[model samples]
Target: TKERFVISRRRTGFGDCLWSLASAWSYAQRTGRTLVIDWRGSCYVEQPFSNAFPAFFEPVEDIAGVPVICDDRVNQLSFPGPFFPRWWNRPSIDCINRPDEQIFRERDELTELFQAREDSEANTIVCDACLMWRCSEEAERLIFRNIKLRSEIRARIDALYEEHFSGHSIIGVHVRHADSELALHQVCMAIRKAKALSYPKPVKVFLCTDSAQVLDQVSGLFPDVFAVPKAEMGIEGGASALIDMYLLARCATVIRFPPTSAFTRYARLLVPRIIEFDNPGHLTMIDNPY
Candidate 1:
């Protein structure tokens, strides 16, 4: 199993990058396979896991933990590679060294159960699998269970938020992942406009951006508000977003800017008029800070 290896690619950006790599690591560990990561510069994968894999394959599997075997002439094979069956896309299966459909179906079922509405409030928790934050009504349980297990991480965030800023009017701004600093500045401008009309008590804006530069720049814009240092929670800094997002959700309100799939998921968990930017267009991995 160790000698004959495979590779996978994770999607780009913050949430996708973390979820994809973490899930892959989990799958690899559960299935007892040596996952080979492939990337040019620094491996974006988290520490203990990235540093642990002994085999340490080259730019072969690169992206997520999807494994690909070297077929001599070719450079590398994509994970859920051509020879693998279609079921690997199911999102729930371990897809370990060998592909299995049972894992896929099992994953789907778990997802359905998690997002189900158990109360009046839309506080439904979903599971994560395949490094994908599986919240879609149709994705498999493998994804859900993986994400659901992350709730422990979420609970920690909730506890921290309660302990730190307990009875205040809070609005979280997730901006750690923009293509450029200018884009981050634009988000600050938007936040200025966003907070202009609110009378909420101490309407605090918690900015979760990448650098201290973001903290400094936004400080100029919203001098009265407070901001959270996202680098403290960046994947490189040993903080997985699982707890981060949860803590932000438990805050007073949310003003999701763009590239907000994780924010959307959290907003869904904390309903009752979550606030977002007015006209957010197609801002994908690039553009504004996460």
Candidate 2:
């Protein structure tokens, strides 16, 4: 019989998918089991995993409606360990790697059902895989090297970069407005701060978002610097998300809210400069910060 771990969750956004897949990949590596991503009812749309990510893991498979079986000993990992910790703050990676720590000890079970949901109370250890602050360098390298867009798409991204961002210091800003109204303010603050620093070549800004309102506002705010139109691609069928993600990765700097979306967190692994707001009103920049 083949050994494999299953990941299943309710319908989630692309950002959530990235985090869950990363967690599944690491867990599978630890246990020497194949990672089978069951994206049946968990995806917003019906699509193959290869549509977004390349085949990065050995024997990794993506299936729909593939039922999972759990015995009594198998643990199901979900978020908010018994302490009800705040979601914004991530647990220290050192503590997570230590066997004596509660979070680390509880994850010793080999067989797990990694449930990626906010309110799920499953028995397995649970956390965002894209917790870049705590993710291991090995995991980061695996993600960065393997999750590449197809060549044709890469060609389009290359063209866009050549047209608008080549030979320029580009700052990529990822704004999510579905749950917050402050996205505009945060992006504007990032631009203002970048301007204040007097970066070379008139820093061009690349805006990535699902919110149309943000697109309209930011484009008008800095018409010369905002490069949305030049990088625009179709959002249908998950292509736009991947395009935006890799485009952001190619940037010289990235400004985004802390874990506002896994897309930004994943991009941080590739960007040299990362600007994150400590709180609603604070601005912190990690310079030459890889």
Candidate 3:
């Protein structure tokens, strides 16, 4: 049975947000609460849901005004048009919204209820419904296992380096994130230059990235290279960033601009010897514990 509910805007394409939500579900399950999302998509309900708003899902325009029925049968908040579904649960303590503002306006009732029932010892709980219906510890353990699994898998697969020899050595690179923040040629130039470090093989590079278009551009310059779509591999949410990074960690010994998240941390944790192009010209060595 569920004891609480949540609301959020369903984001696009399954990735980090989805994984984060799954982690939240695991946390909630551990805390013994049933969490329901106001699902508003064709595929709104993933694994943990007691029930969801049918096909005609709508948003609550005024979160404060959304009806919160606390009946034994159903404790739900009805919303208006175009309102979002549940997303984040850890409400910021530093939010400065007044009673009438969008952040805190009309939140007294829910706040009062939340304060009265919350278990002090078990404070960091997340999505309860997901936990309630799990085959096992879904999000966290899956991410952990896959990190190691992906690395081993990739290493085994890429081991057949002799099959596709381009007369050069293979340099793997994953350049995701910071797409809006960094220039293409600048990113490529730095990574490409790193492969120049003495190798008996001719150094054919294998690139992994969100923008595979960059792969085409880079390949145009270095035709003797191979690039794989980082997304095509299980890098992002399958195991979160670690999955993606782990695959890259195995496939590529060299990485250009890296991401900063648990994904990166887990990636580095598994493949400690990853090469980081942190500065303008210096390539640094980082340890991967796994």
Candidate 4:
């Protein structure tokens, strides 16, 4: 009997775990193998994978004691061995936006030519980059389909927008408050940039951040800027956290900090034009032509 190809991950945060799932799914689809997840460790301690999103994953849990192979195992397979010759190379992070299709194609050829692990049911491929996939539209659809929000939360978000942001152009601002000096500077510059725009309409700022201090500062600075009323809807990885992220995604443009959190990256799915700050004073736009 042939062993199945499984995919799993170690304990990680929401963004990292999500990205790993994307990568694993892509690899599994390419290789015509079944993918299973091992969510035993701290990877899902807070979010529990099930409660995080209202999606159906139908995961397998019995592979706990099974000796599953990981990236390290793939790395060690690099010798002149006939068992799995081509797969011995270092694994690459398959990003969805910037995919390395050529390398993946080469991998597919090697797997077929050498019959690498052809009949192994016990072989598991652990993809670390969950945010990567082949088709952008397909990946977005898959992600959005699985992440249906609760009714009440969605209602609240809608109400908030109607009350504060009905007929205004919105620019999402994700200011990092831990480093208040840099965050404040970015906020100031973002506001300036928005005001200076010849956008032919009134532009409003929807401030999303981990700090009330940032909200107060930005709101105090600009009359058009606003934030959600309920500050602590939930902690990171909770439903409330998702609410803030999706709300940001509805904006026209997002001014985010570089080395941003998973929340920021996830928001980029719906809101593609991201103005990332390389430094406190200057910023660069990602995927935004204008």
Mind giving the per-residue lDDT tens digits that candidate 4 earns over 1-290? 34445343434455555554545444455555555444434322343433322221222222223322322233233222122223433354523333456436544543343244453332444332233332344544454555345666677778877876677778888765456676687678867775665554478888877688778888988878887754122232344455667788777778775435665656676664677767555766667432
List per-prediction Cα lDDT, in the order shown: 0.43, 0.54, 0.41, 0.54
Ranking by TM-score: 2, 4, 1, 3
* TM-score of model number 3: 0.43
| Model 1 Cα lDDT, one tens digit per residue, 1-290 | 21322232432443454344444444343333444433222233443223312212222432234343222222243333222223445355555444335545534644453344441111111112333554332222233233232344445566667655566666666664536656775676566655664545666666665567767777776754554344222332333444455556555555565534653444334533355544453222212212
**Residues 178-222 of candidate 3: C-alpha lDDT, one tens digit per residue:** 644356656666665666566665556666565656767777777
Local error of candidate 1 at residue 53 (angstroms): 14
lDDT of 1 at 47: 35
Candidate 3 lowest-lDDT run of ten: 79-88
Cα lDDT tens digits for candidate 2, 103-184? 3333332123333223223223333222222336556556456555556657777888888788887888887654455767
Top-TM-score candidate index: 2
Candidate 1 has its poorest 10 consecutive residues by lDDT at 119-128
TM-score of each: 0.45, 0.63, 0.43, 0.62
* Backbone clashes under 3 angstroms, per model: 33, 4, 18, 9
TM-score of 4: 0.62
